[PDB]
Structure 1
Amino acid sequence: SHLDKVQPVIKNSDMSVEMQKEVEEVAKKAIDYCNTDKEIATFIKDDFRSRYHGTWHCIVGRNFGSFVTFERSYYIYLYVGQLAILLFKTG
C-alpha cells in the first residue's frame, strides 16, 4: 500500500504524457529499491540512459534550485514526499 501513499506529484513536466507516466513508476521503484539518496540519482540516470540514449544529468534532494540548459522535450521535475527527482538530457 506504500505505492498508493507516496503518490508522486509532478510540478513541472515539459515532456509527453506517455514518457511522463513511465517516470512515475521508475521514480517510485527507485526509492523503495534504494537505501540512500545518492543511490536514487544513480538508478534513475542509468535506467533512462538504457531506455533513451544520450547524456542525462539527475539531481534529487530535500532543498535545492535548478537553472539548466536541456534538450527541449527532455526535462521533468517531480517531488515525492520531500525528494525532487530532477532529470534532464543535454547535447
Structure 2
Amino acid sequence: STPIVKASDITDKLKEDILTISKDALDKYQLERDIAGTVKKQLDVKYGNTWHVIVGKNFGSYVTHEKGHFVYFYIGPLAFLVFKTA
C-alpha cells in the first residue's frame, strides 16, 4: 500500500501531493479511468493545465512531459503515470 516511485522528474513537494491525491482517489472510485480522471482534473485546477493520467496493471507508454512534471509509481498492484504538458 506504500507508494513505490519507479521513475520521476519532479520536486518532492509536488510528488507528495500527487501521491496523496492518488491514494485518496483509490478510496472513492472502483474504475481505473475514474481514478485517473479525478487525479487529472484536480491537478489541472490546483497547478494549471494540462495534466494526463494513466492508471492500470498492464501497459507500456511513451510520452512527453514538461520538465519537473512527471512521476510514475505503484500503489499496491496499480501503476500510476502522471504528467503535465502545456
Alignment of 1:18 with 2:13, yes or no, is yes
Tell me the distance in 2 between the aligned counterparts of 1:12 and 1:88. 12
Aligned length: 86
Gaps of 5+ in 1: 1-5
Gaps of 5+ in 2: none
Deviations 1:27-63 (A, max 9, x none): 1101111121111011110110011111111111111
Identity %: 38
Tell me the distance in 2 between the aligned counterparts of 1:16 and 1:41. 21
Q: CA offset at residue 25 of structure 1?
A: 1.1
Please report the TM-score for the alignment, with normalisation by the length of structure 1.
Answer: 0.87
Name whichever structure is richer in strand by fraction: 2
Q: Provide runs of 4+ in structure 1 moved above 6 Å.
A: none
Tell me the distance in 2 between the aligned counterparts of 1:62 and 1:31. 14
